[PDB]
């Protein structure tokens, strides 16, 4: 019914942790640069909580914020209130990026075609998690080691998966 | 259609720069040693402009120069004029190395199975670039930090990717 590619863009740790105290648990600017490169020119779909922590519209991409608040407005951003409204807004898009956080990852989980997932080899203290996924009918199409140096203090890998059927 | 493994051998910077003023933009003897080690005993496929800058046949390898010049000859070197002519000359080879530069990298890009790519963590002035690549269905099978010392003044990593399908 929807015809834009639904992609998940996420970074998580050994226990699926993605967030702590309404923020990121880790500082990895190189991972952020990979994120910016991959998502450039494509809509970003983010939950209200995810967006507000970010604070600003992210440049070179349609910023779409998901909230139940029927009177929510932010300048230079579009607002959706459901999965379907997002699909309407993105009717003609090539590929959209579900950008988090957990509640929004849950929301769109039945619709994911492609998963860009960064795996961090460390056990962080956290309160927000990426939901479990049945990977049957999923094929790993890409994997590479992330940059570990003095500015990026963890070991991590970029993985990309595509759904077969 | 062809049966030899087609490998790319390339060193590039943060912006895909591979050349400046028909030469290399950096001096990195250690990276040269890695190159000589990995390519030894295998054919080198070089664009005419790449070859002439080098100046001499490289020992222990078949040197194959790619040119449109139907009357071009160099002693101790073989001359091809097309992708297919290279494939003919290399029909029995296990693995051939596409050695550059840009025009020759473009030429063979549809056929690459393996990528040996050094990434240099510096932004050089340059005029020649390694083409963009869709890494879908490629997996990184090797990564290691290059030697940084007084004789090799940059930060760089050796990467190897293999095509899955
Ligand atoms: N490391 C990573 O890859 C990522 C981590 N994060 C982290 O995750 C955390 C944020 O995630 P989380 O707390 O789950 O919050 P979310 O980003 O998922 O936002 C939650 C909000 O989304 C809206 N919402 C949820 N469901 C619906 C629905 N069905 N219909 C309409 N609107 C809905 C609600 O907005 P409202 O209340 O206004 O109605 C809700 O409060 C932070 O810690 C953040 O840093 C976020 C993205 C990526
Ligand atoms: N850092 C690295 O990994 C590498 C960098 N380099 C750098 O790259 C630069 C050179 O690259 P570039 O300028 O692209 O030159 P090339 O090495 O690609 O040589 C170009 C020549 O190849 C021949 N050629 C191109 N297309 C075809 C074709 N379709 N059929 C037959 N022959 C063809 C032509 O020769 P003709 O004119 O005779 O007809 C053309 O002039 C230099 O600066 C060099 O130092 C080179 C290799 C590796
Ligand atoms: C951890 C990164 C990240 N990586 C990947 N692979 N996917 C994602 N979806 C996100 C994400 C996210 C949320 C996010 C992004 C940000 O920069 C744009 C933030 O600003 C610094 C931010 O501050 C609170 C929060
Ligand atoms: C930068 C090295 C290099 N590294 C990698 N990883 N791949 C490559 N394909 C090349 C290359 C190249 C071209 C090249 C080679 C040379 O020595 C053999 C050169 O002599 C000093 C040279 O001078 C004009 C030019």
Kindly provide the resolution of this structure in angstroms, with one decimal: 2.6
Does any ligand 2 atom lie closer than 6 A to the CB of residue B48? Answer: yes
Three-state SS for A30?
A: helix
Nearest residue (by CA) to ligand 4, atom 20, is B54
Residue A65 in contact with residue A79, Cβ under 8 Å?
yes
- Quick count: other Cβ atoms within 10 Å of Cβ B104? 23
Which residues constitute the domain of residue B3? 1-165
Cα(B102)–Cα(B18) distance, rounded to whole angstroms? 8
Q: How many CA atoms lie within 13 A of A142 on its CB side?
A: 14
Overall residue count recorded for chain A in this entry: 165
Residue B66 in contact with residue B48, Cβ under 8 Å?
yes
Cα(B23)–Cα(A22) distance, rounded to whole angstroms? 51
Minimum-distance CB partner of A145 among B138, B140, B164:
B140
Closest CA to A86 of A47, A40, A41: A47
Closest CA to B60 of B44, B40, B90: B40
Cα(B37)–Cα(B26) distance, rounded to whole angstroms? 19
Domains in chain A: how many in total?
A: 1
**Which DSSP helix (H) or strand (E) runs through A49?**
helix A48-54
Residue A50 in contact with residue A56, Cβ under 8 Å?
no
- Which tokens go with A52? 């507000």
Chain A hits for B138, CB-CB cut-off 8 Å, are 142
Three-state SS for A99?
A: strand
Q: Which residue has the tokens 């490998």?
A: B7
- CA–CA–CA angle A112, A117, A122 (5° rounding): 140
Closest CA to A163 of A116, A129, A130, A118: A116
Residue B29 in contact with residue B151, Cβ under 8 Å?
yes
Residue A7 in contact with residue A98, Cβ under 8 Å?
yes
Residue A141 in contact with residue B137, Cβ under 8 Å?
yes
| B83 CB-contact burial (10 Å; exposed 0-12 / middle 13-18 / buried 19+) | middle
- Which tokens go with A39? 């998502």
**Pairwise CB contact (< 8 Å): A143 & B143:** no
What CATH number is associated with residue A28? Answer: 3.40.430.10
Closest CA to A43 of A5, A81, A15: A5
Closest CA to A28 of A121, A106, A99: A121
Beta-strand relationship, A95-100 and A5-13? parallel
Overall residue count recorded for chain B in this entry: 165
Q: What string of DSSP letters covers B41-88?
A: TS-EEEEHHHHHHH-SPPTTS-EEEE-S-TT---TT-EEE-SHHHHHH
């Amino acid at each position: 019914h929807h015809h834009m590619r639904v992609s998940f863009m996420v970074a998580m740790d050994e226990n699926r942790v993605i967030g702590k105290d309404n923020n990121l648990p880790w500082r990895l600017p190189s991972e952020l640069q990979y994120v910016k490169k991959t998502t450039m020119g494509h809509p970003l779909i983010m939950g209200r909580k995810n967006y507000e922590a970010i604070g600003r519209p992210l440049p070179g991409r349609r910023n779409i914020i998901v909230t139940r608040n029927e009177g929510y407005h932010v300048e230079g951003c579009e607002v959706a209130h459901s999965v379907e409204e997002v699909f309407e807004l993105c009717k003609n898009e090539e590929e959209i990026f579900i950008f988090g956080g957990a509640q929004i990852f849950d929301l769109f989980l039945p619709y994911v075609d492609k998963l860009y997932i960064t795996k961090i080899h460390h056990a962080f203290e956290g309160d927000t998690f990426f939901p479990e996924m049945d990977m049957t009918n999923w094929k790993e199409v890409f994997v590479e080691k992330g940059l570990t140096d003095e500015k990026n203090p963890y070991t991590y890998y970029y993985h990309v998966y595509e759904k077969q059927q």
